Symmetry: D2
């Protein structure tokens, strides 16, 4: 479970499905190289994006297409997209789960690490 | 699927709560919160299968989590004595409920989800 | 400028919550929640005028925030029956306490701001 | 009393965060971020002066609260590099924006209000 970046809808009381997500890597030129993207069908979870060999001991970024989400449900969010920036794998391979409790005009997140 | 479960995880250690005592009750017209079930937070910080289809009924419930015991063992002196999640259930039939519990020494937050038939 | 300030915010409309029922209790010697204070949240979203250091004493307290009146009168269908915040108070030094509540129809958050005046 | 306001609350100490560096950008026509305003946080955990209604105009803006240096000063090991809030401003008209951010060593949350 490298990045099981779960996203939850705090209004519909269901996982946020069909929400586009984008990943980036730390480029040496202070740029964000695109890495992966996708949309879900029924459940709002992220997986199968980065493999054990795809990681680096560096900075990352996760972008979630949030404004496009609510227009479909006819909601007009204040936020445009959400970004979490972190340093990973400093002490070796660990499994990272990124929380994301969305809401129109509000969001929250949390990080879960492992010992080995 | 699991009829309902409680999800709890520490926002300081970045790990699910381990050995955080939990309890459940039932609403009684005499205001007496008659105890119904209890449990201990495992290494995964989750308790599931507490209320079966027969055990659970359409009514008012409460979930109590022994937050203060969780911190003092870690040598941490928290603010909240415990937490409570008061709600209604099965308004129009049986459903699946999973609730969140983001513990921090001086704060917490909860969130619940419902899945349509 | 009170030792007990409760702020309630709407995480859908993005406005300070208004017309929200608030109740304050206190555990008695018989483990009884003797009523302490109550009120309704204004359009500023800050509840105040609930207690003073003359009336505020050491002990275990409880804070009640109604939710059904907030959304059902608004037309939204909530999940949580209400919000209950229970905490020790004035253990040593009557520090001013601020209680924060970020409300969503299916989720809420609580945080405490403590400071010695 | 400003159209833009940001406040950061520390959960572990339960006190308003102090000395939290902040920066504000603007959506440049070259898809860049021209720096707009920056600063740190006081003992009240709020922002004292960010943007007047004169400088505040339409467009997309980004605000970042520096947290990595925070917990190192606190002596705790963080996780997040920092927190990024990006939003569309003045899409329909003037308003007053307040940004609230609850910070914990391994988690954070945020929300906004309008006027
Ligand atoms: O009010 C919030 O949005 C909030 C969100 C998460 C955690 C705590 C919160 N409470 C809170 C936040 C702020 Cl910024 C605040 O005042 O700012 O001038 C108050 Cl009174 C209460």
């Amino acid at each position: 479970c490298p990045l099981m970046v779960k996203v939850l809808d705090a209004v519909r009381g269901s996982p946020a499905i069909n929400v586009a997500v984008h990943v980036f890597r730390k480029a040496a030129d202070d740029t964000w190289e695109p890495f992966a993207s996708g949309k879900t069908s029924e459940s709002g979870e992220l997986h199968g994006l980065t493999t054990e060999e795809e990681f680096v001991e560096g900075i990352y970024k996760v972008e979630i297409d949030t404004k496009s989400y609510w227009k479909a449900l006819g909601i007009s969010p204040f936020h445009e997209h959400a970004e979490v920036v972190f340093t990973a794998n400093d002490s070796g391979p660990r499994r990272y789960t990124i929380a994301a409790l969305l809401s129109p005009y509000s969001y929250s997140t949390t990080a879960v690490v492992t010992n080995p």
